[PDB]
Amino acid sequence: NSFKEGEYVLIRFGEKKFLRKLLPKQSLSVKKSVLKFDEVIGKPEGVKINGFEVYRPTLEEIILLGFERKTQIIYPKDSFYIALKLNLNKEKRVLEFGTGSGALLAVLSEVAGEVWTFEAVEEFYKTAQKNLKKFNLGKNVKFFNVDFKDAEVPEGIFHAAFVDVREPWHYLEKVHKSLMEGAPVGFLLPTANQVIKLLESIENYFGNLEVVEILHRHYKTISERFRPEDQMVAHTAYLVFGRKLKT
Amino acid sequence: NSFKEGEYVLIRFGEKKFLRKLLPKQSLSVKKSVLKFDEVIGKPEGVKINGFEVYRPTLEEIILLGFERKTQIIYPKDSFYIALKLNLNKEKRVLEFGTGSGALLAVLSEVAGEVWTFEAVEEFYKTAQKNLKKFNLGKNVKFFNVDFKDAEVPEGIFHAAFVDVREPWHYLEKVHKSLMEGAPVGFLLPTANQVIKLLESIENYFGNLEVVEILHRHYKTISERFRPEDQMVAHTAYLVFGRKLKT
């Protein structure tokens, strides 16, 4: 299959990546160098045109460059670890809230058998849906435009849960009840205060606790001057993991 | 889903995790405290017995505590990112060599639809099969006890490839040939020397180059004394990613 028009492509030029829809007679220009989308439409993946390499985007590239952000997203750095740390596969059901823009959801969807997501704000609920539908994702996802505390969530049936909210300690009882015995949970908390607060509240519900931070550092890809890049993302969030306690 | 005899359990006591097979009359003793396995048979996951929390192990815990190591392994820190970075799902076929102890393979197998894996050393080839089989994994894996260079491999059948060998640059042409157009490739390299050498020749075959290292720092999960651990894994390997260029 060759490059069709109207489809989103990943363009590499120098150190930088670009995501662009292949619309006729439109172009990408970067520092005097021009790539015309008309020369791309009809070519295979991995073509080199005037210094521009063109491919179809991966899941990581789709999330980072394709997804509209109406809220703070969970980056692949974290979500690629989270999905598999939650011990997910195609035999498993996972609970997520809040959906936000669907950045974590896209990864949970790709790994798990079934996802139930909850998002209180209607705008973000529509945005996450749009994001995933746009890139052919989320066919195993049930979206709910409701506050998790008000939702009717089937008790004792989820193989895992992941919580991304400001104050997750207000939802611990219900999350606990939604899960199967011994099931993994994960929490995303940007702040140390939130983590301390969650650790104060979690003891009745989840054991085998783990808190981890993930750092990625990229390197220059030039052979003769191999070294780390000048800057890196320093922090996205503390990741909190546990396992359901019987009670 | 209560604990049955002979099955593997993950035990947490204090800061430590233990993986133990549930054998009759046998026990686990740490710092005086004893956990008798007869007392855990018939109990649900997330039961707490004498300060010991017991669960079934996750994929990460299986790899780290359960897999027999005849070689250096690829750690979940890296492999969880690798599997999804390579854009894998159930519709994808992935190439891997060398199999080694099967630690990366276990993750590839869970994420991908199909894996072809090559290991030249017979005892490593046997250990990898034993590792995954012991934990009910690798049902979608084709194991080959041959040097990849001698293998009969149809061209353009792989949606992704991952290479973990001392000198990957010798295999670039065959891997490129075995991949479908524009397909992701990844390389595991422990030393900067290897990365530098790979970067000399790689651009004849693969573009959209990325080199990243992944660091995990774990935290004390005590609410009142929240802080990072004393020590961490500093380095496992440099990860280099690319995409098949059309030749």
Place this chain on the structure above:
Amino acid sequence: NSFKEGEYVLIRFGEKKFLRKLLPKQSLSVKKSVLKFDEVIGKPEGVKINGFEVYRPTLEEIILLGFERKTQIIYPKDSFYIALKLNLNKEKRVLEFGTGSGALLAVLSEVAGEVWTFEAVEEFYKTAQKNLKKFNLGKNVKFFNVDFKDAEVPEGIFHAAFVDVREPWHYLEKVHKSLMEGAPVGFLLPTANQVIKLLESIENYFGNLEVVEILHRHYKTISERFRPEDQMVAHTAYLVFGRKLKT
């Protein structure tokens, strides 16, 4: 400059450093390889005997390998930054408490013109003096065996202060008074809880606030296999810096 009987030497063997007194008739053995100290005495610095390289220790090696530890110490990774971040030189007077084992003191002493140090525990007060004198350090230091709250400290004579105690917020007013206008202050705090607590109480005393953590990753020094070490120190403490606000 030849090695004398009884002096402390830094011995390097393979990847490892050793600090030893040059005692006659004595030896160091590592992996069945033997260094005889009689062969070292009377030799120049930087001799190599039986694979062992022998030098006089530096400030960092003295603190790390030579100082007796009765308390948690401040490591050179932090202390080398701290002393210069506090803007110390030979025309500066610095306040420090608690002295502990004198590990930070050694650095403050080397950089600043004079140091007033306070330690409430007399066993620790004595150990710190023993450490420093043993290695010909601390001639510019006034040691006090007193609680800092009870100490007779002249107001406005200190160019900087550093506080290493469990609950530094109790002593803010007195440290503030002891400091010259706009003078730098630093705090060492192992936990996030402690930093959060100091930050809410420091508001009316110190401004230009900074919190930093310092990570050192070491590398293999083998040319053909250049890569980071397997393990590193993950955390020592958060460092909090401010400047005296005029009240």
Place this chain on the structure above:
Amino acid sequence: NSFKEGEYVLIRFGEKKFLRKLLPKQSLSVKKSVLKFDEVIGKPEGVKINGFEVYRPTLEEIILLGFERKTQIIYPKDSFYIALKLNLNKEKRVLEFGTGSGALLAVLSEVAGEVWTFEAVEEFYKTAQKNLKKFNLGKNVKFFNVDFKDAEVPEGIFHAAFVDVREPWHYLEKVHKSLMEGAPVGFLLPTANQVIKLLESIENYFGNLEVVEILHRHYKTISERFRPEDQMVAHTAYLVFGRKLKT
């Protein structure tokens, strides 16, 4: 002593530091907020006016915000560790080249008793002098405008050396000869290629080898949302340290 006109002051407003010369009638605007210098002149350090805190700058702030950069500089993160790692004090003479903009020099000058620095490029030689002079530094520094290879330097008179050039391996024999027995040496190298090459070259001249990289992560200083900053400096350089081997 209150602020005088013509003084360079450190101004803190929100998260940002500013270094400005106190010019009468002049101001600093941060968006719509204004600080009038006429209100600062005649006031003590640590004064707060309309949200702006004003101090005199420390060595770190002088280097980072005050020094004119005509080369790549060595940052305080590295130089503060370097100066004390080289075991410098007021009884030590240190060799340095190339001087560059004088950022490392300022620190060596503050710590050592005497510095001999060499810079081949006349412009940078003048820049380094102008930088230190402007902030009342470097009175113990001998500046030379010459290639180190061509300079007449007394044998065995340096207690330490630091080398910041592209290819330091060329100067090893001379640096070695200029050093006292057992003396520390340091090298700054941006790339792994350079480190690899130096390690290949250094074996006959320097032992007790160490390679380290230093990372600083800064934190939000808001009590109720304590977390690391979003971004950090990922890499400045690899730091190589050794000790003179007897030849």
